[PDB]
Amino acid sequence: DFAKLAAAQGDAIDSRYHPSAAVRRQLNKVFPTHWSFLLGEIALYSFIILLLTGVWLTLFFDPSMAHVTYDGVYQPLRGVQMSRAYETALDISFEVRGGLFVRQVHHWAALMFAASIMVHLARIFFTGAFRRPREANWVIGSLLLILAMFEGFFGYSLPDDLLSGTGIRAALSGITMGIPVIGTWMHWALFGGDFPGEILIPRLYALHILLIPGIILALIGAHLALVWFQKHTQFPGPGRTETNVVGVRVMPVFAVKSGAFFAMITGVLGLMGGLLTINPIWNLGPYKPSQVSAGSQPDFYMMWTDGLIRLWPAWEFYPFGHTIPQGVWVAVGMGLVFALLIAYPFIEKKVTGDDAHHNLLQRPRDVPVRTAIGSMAIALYLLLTFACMNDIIALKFHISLNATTWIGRIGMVVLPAIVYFVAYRWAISLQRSDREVLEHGVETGIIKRLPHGAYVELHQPLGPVDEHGHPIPLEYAGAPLPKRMNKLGSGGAPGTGSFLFPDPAVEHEALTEAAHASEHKSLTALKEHQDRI
Amino acid sequence: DFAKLAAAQGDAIDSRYHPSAAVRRQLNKVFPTHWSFLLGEIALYSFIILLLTGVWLTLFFDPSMAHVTYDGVYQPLRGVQMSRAYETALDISFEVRGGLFVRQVHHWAALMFAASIMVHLARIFFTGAFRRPREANWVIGSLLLILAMFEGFFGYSLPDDLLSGTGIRAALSGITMGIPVIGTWMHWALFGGDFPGEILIPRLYALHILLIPGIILALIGAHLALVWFQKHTQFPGPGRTETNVVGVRVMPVFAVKSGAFFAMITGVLGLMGGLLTINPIWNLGPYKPSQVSAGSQPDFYMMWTDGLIRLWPAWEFYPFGHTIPQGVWVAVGMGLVFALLIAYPFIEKKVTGDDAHHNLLQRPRDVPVRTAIGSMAIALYLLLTFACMNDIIALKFHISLNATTWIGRIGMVVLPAIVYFVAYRWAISLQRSDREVLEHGVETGIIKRLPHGAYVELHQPLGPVDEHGHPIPLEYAGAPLPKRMNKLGSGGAPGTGSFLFPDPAVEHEALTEAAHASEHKSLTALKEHQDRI
C-alpha cells in the first residue's frame, strides 16, 4: 500500500516532531485570488531562476582582469588581447554545450525580475497596500528594488566587454570620482586606484554571486514572512471586511496555482532564452579605453539614471579652486528619488492624516490624488528611460538628436504636469461612470421606440425597483460595477458538445442545470455570510 | 524618555505584527546549563567568524590560474612566475593593511570549526543524544561534518601554493582518476581536462565562497531549528524527568551566557590570529608540478584520510588489461567510514532493539559497549592522523620512517582492539566505583584507631542510616555521585573580605547566613518539585 506507507511516515514524523497543528494552520491559510496578487510571485520565480542559472554560470566563469590572448574557437577574435573574464564569458557561450542558452536565460530572467518588481510596486502603490500595518514591508520592497538594480548592473559588467566597460567607466568611475571632498577617495577605495585597475571585476564578481544576492535573499525572506503572518490585503467585495480574508485555502488550490504559475513563468523565460538573442558579447569585443560604439545604453532598469545624465544641463560650480561637475546633480537626484520612494507611506500619512489600520484595498480611481501622483511619476520614469534611448530613437525615427534632448529637457517638467492633470480628471471620471450605473442600472444597449415616438434605452437594475419601475439608487461600496449585460450572464451558453459535434440533449440539460444551481449556491453562501456579519 | 520610547516602540510593533505571545514563548524557553551543551555553539560561532572574515577576503582575492610575474613587495619572490591566485593571496598578506591578520583568523577559525564539530560529535555519541526522536538531527550533523571537511580543504587549496597544490595533485586528481570505469570521466568533468588545467581554482572558489557555505548554512538552520523545537536533552538528576526540561530561561540568563561565550570564543580566535603563524604561503612558493617539499600534510581534519593512504598496502588488481590501483581502497574506505557514521543510530537501534523515546541522557560509563566502540573509533582516528604526520614524527622523535609505517599498519588493527577492551573494563569499573559510594557513603579520608586497635575510615552517608549507624544502601539513579567531602561543603569558606583585608565581622556573618539560606531554599525547591512529580 502507498496509503500504508504514507500513514507510517506521517506517524513517524508526528511522533518525532509533533507538527500536526502548525502544518494544519499552514494548510488552512486563506489567500485572495485576485489576478494582481500574482505579480510578486513573478519576481520571486525570476529570482529563483536567476539563482539556479547563476550557480551554473559560476562553474565556468573566471573573473580575472589579467590580460591574455584569446585562442578559442571564435575566429573573428583570434589573437585579440582580452581579460580572462571576457575570454571565459566567450568560452561559456561557445565551448560549453548549453552555455549560451544558460547565459541568455540568466540575463532575460534578470530583465523579467526588474520589470515584475516595477509592476508589483505599481500595484502596491496604486491600491494603497503600503498603508499601516504594512509600511515596513513597503520599505523592505523598496530596498529590494534598489538592490536588484545594482545587482543586475554588476552582473552584466562582469564579462568586461566594450559596451559594459563603457558603462563602468562613465557611471561607476566617472560619477563617483566627481563627488565633492570624498569622491576620489570612494573611487580609490572601490577600484583600488584609478580606473580600470586590476581588482574591479573580481570584487564585482564577489559582490554579485554572494554578497548582494545573500542580502536580497534575506530581505525576500523577511518580505514573504511579513506577508504570510500579516495576512495579505484584499479588495472590497461581497463578504469582504476589514477583519476577514476571502479566497482559497493553501491546500490544495493555492498550492496548485502557485506551482503552475511557476512552471509557466519558467517556460516563458526558457522560450525567450532560446528564441531571442540578448547581450551577444562576441560582437562587442573586449573592453579597451580607446574604443567606443554608438548606442551606449545600460539595461533598461538603469536607463532612467542614464537618461537623467543626458538631460540635466551642463551646470557646474568652481568655488575657491575646486570643481563641482555636472554628474554631482545626477548622484544627488538618484538619492532624492530613492529617499522619496522609501519614505512615501510616511509622507502620505503625514499629508492625509490617515493613520488607521487598513486591510481593504482602494480602487485606484477612488484615490484620485495618489493615482495622479503615481501616473506623474511613471510619466517621468518613461521620459527618462526614452531619453536614454534618444540616440537610437533619433536614428530609427528620424528625429534630430539635439531635438530629442531638448524634447526630454522640456518634457521632464511639462509631461508630468499634463499627466497629473489628466490622470486626476480621468480617475474622477471613472468615479462618475460608477455612480451612473449605481443610479440607473446597466445600459443594455437595447433601444426601443415608444408609441408617442420617444426613444429609450433599456436598463438592467442592480437592485430593487419602485412602483414606477425605476431602480432604487444603490450606494457605492468600493467595489467594481458591471457595465456589460453579457458579463451578467445575458448571453447564456452554446449547446454543450465538442467544438464540432453536440452531445445528447439530456447531458446538456443536466450540465446546464447543475451549473446554474452551483452558481446560485455560491452567490447565496457569500450573501448569507455577508448578511450575518 | 528612555522608558516612554520603549513603550511606544513596543506598542507600534505589537499593533502591526502582534508578536507578543510568540516572543514570550521564546523568552520562556528553558535550556539545561550543562557545560558540555556549549560544545555545539563553539562550532556555530566559528562558522560565523568564518563568514565574516571570508566576506572580507573575497574583496581582494582573484582566483585565476592565469600565469603572471610577481611585481609586489615581497623581495624573495620578485620576478617569479605564479598564478593570479597566488599573487593576490600574497597581496592580501603584504599589501592590504590587516590582510595577514584576517587571513590567519580565517584559517584558525576553520581549524576550530572542525575541532569543535569533532568534540561536539563525541558528546552526542557518548551521551546517546542521537536516539529517537533525534536520529535525523544526527544525520544532519554528520553531513555538516563532511561538508566542513571538504569546505576547509577547498579553502586552503585556493592560494595555489606549492604545498596545497601538491595536496590537490595527489588527492583530488590522483585518487579521482584512479576510480574504476568512471574515474577518468569524473576527473575530466571536475578539472575540465587533465590536471592542473585552467578552470580548477575559479571553480573551487565558486564552491568555497557560495555553494558549499550556502548548503552548510541551510543545514545549520535546520539543525538549530530541530534542536529548538525538539527541546534539548538533559542528564538525569534531581527533578529531571523524561517529560520536563530543567535549566534557565532564555531571558536573560541563557542569552547573556551565549553572548559572553561568543565574545570569548572570538577573543581566543583573535589572539591566535595575531600570535601564531598559520599557513605562511610566501615561504612555500607558487605551485609547480616539478617541485615538492618534505612534509606534505593536509589540515588536520583531512589527515586521517591521508594517513589511510600512507598505511594501506600496495595491493592492486590488473583484470583483463585494466588497472585497479591502490588509491581505490582509500576511496572505498572513506565512503565506508561516512556511511557508518551517518547510519549509526539505526545500526544501534537494530542491534539493541531499543526504539523508545529518550530525553534523558546516558552517562558514558553506563553504556559500556557504546563507550568502548567510540573509544575504539577515536583510537583509529588518532592513529591515522598521526600516521599522516609519520615523517615529521620520524624527524623530530628519532624513529625510522619505515618503522613508523609498520607501527601504523599493525596498530591499525591492534590499537583499536586494545582500546576497546580497556574502555569497556574502565566503564564498568566506574560503575563499580559509583556503587561503592552508594552502599557505604563518601570516604572522608579520616582514619581513626578504635580502642581495641582497629583502623576505620569515617564515611559520610548520602542518605538515612541504621540504628547501628551504617547507611541504608541507595539506588543508582543515572546521576553522578560525590566522592570528595570538600565538594559537599565540608571545607567551609575562608572569611569575607578583599584578598588582603577582612570585611567587618557583621557583614561576613550576614553574607554567610544569606548564602546558606539561599542554598537550602534552592535544594528544597528542587526536592519538593521532585517529590510532587
Ligand code: HEM
Ligand atoms: C524582489 C522584489 C520583490 C518581491 C520578490 C516581492 C514579492 C512579493 C510577494 C510574493 C508578495 C505577496 C503577493 C502579492 O501581493 O503580490 C508581496 C507583497 C508585498 N510586497 Fe512585494 N516583492 C518585492 C518587492 C516589493 C516592492 C518594490 C514593494 C513596494 C515598494 C513591495 C511591497 C509589498 C507589499 C506592501 C506587499 C504586501 C501587499 C499586500 O498584502 O497586499 N514589494 N511581495
Ligand code: HEM
Ligand atoms: C538578483 C539576481 C541576479 C541578477 C539580476 C543577475 C543578473 C545578471 C546579469 C544581468 C548578468 C550579465 C549576464 C550576461 O551574461 O549576459 C549576470 C551575469 C552573471 N551572473 Fe548573474 N544575476 C543575479 C544573480 C546571480 C547569482 C546568484 C549568481 C550566482 C551564484 C550569478 C552568477 C552570474 C555569473 C557568473 C555571471 C557571469 C556569467 C556571464 O556573464 O555570462 N548571478 N547576472
Ligand code: HEM
Ligand atoms: C556545523 C556543525 C555543527 C553545529 C554548528 C552544531 C551545532 C549544534 C548546537 C548548538 C546544538 C545544541 C547545543 C548542544 O547540545 O551543544 C546542537 C545539537 C545537536 N547536534 Fe549538533 N552541530 C553540528 C554538528 C553535529 C554533529 C556532527 C552531530 C552528530 C553527528 C550533531 C548532532 C547534534 C544533536 C543530535 C544535537 C541535539 C542534542 C541534544 O539535544 O542534546 N551535530 N548542535
Ligand code: HEM
Ligand atoms: C565552513 C566555512 C569555511 C571554512 C572551513 C573555510 C576554510 C578556509 C581555509 C582553511 C582557507 C585557507 C586560508 C588561508 O589562506 O590560509 C580559506 C580561504 C578562503 N576562504 Fe574560506 N572557509 C570557510 C568559509 C568561507 C566563506 C563563507 C567565504 C566567503 C565569504 C570564504 C572565503 C575565502 C577566501 C576568499 C579564501 C581565499 C583567500 C585566502 O586564502 O586567503 N570562506 N578558507
Ligand SMILES: CCCCCCCCCCCCCC(=O)O[C@H](COC(=O)CCCCCCCCCCC)COP(=O)(O)O
Ligand atoms: C512528507 C513525507 C511523508 C508524507 C506523508 C504524511 C502525510 C500523510 C499521513 C496522514 C494522512 C493519511 C491519514 C493517516 O495516516 O493518518 C495518521 C497519520 O497522520 C497523522 O496522524 C500525522 C500526519 C502529520 C504529518 C504531516 C506533515 C507533512 C505532510 C504533508 C505532505 C504533503 C495515521 O492514521 P491512524 O493512526 O491509523 O489513525
Ligand SMILES: CCCCCCCCCCCCCC(=O)O[C@H](COC(=O)CCCCCCCCCCC)COP(=O)(O)O
Ligand atoms: C525591538 C525594538 C523595540 C524594543 C522595545 C520593546 C520592548 C519594551 C516594550 C514593553 C516593555 C515595557 C512595558 C510596556 O511598554 O508595556 C507595553 C508595551 O509592550 C507591549 O504591550 C508589547 C511589547 C511586545 C513587543 C516586543 C517584541 C520584541 C522586543 C524585545 C526586545 C529585547 C505598553 O504599556 P501600556 O500600554 O502603557 O500598559
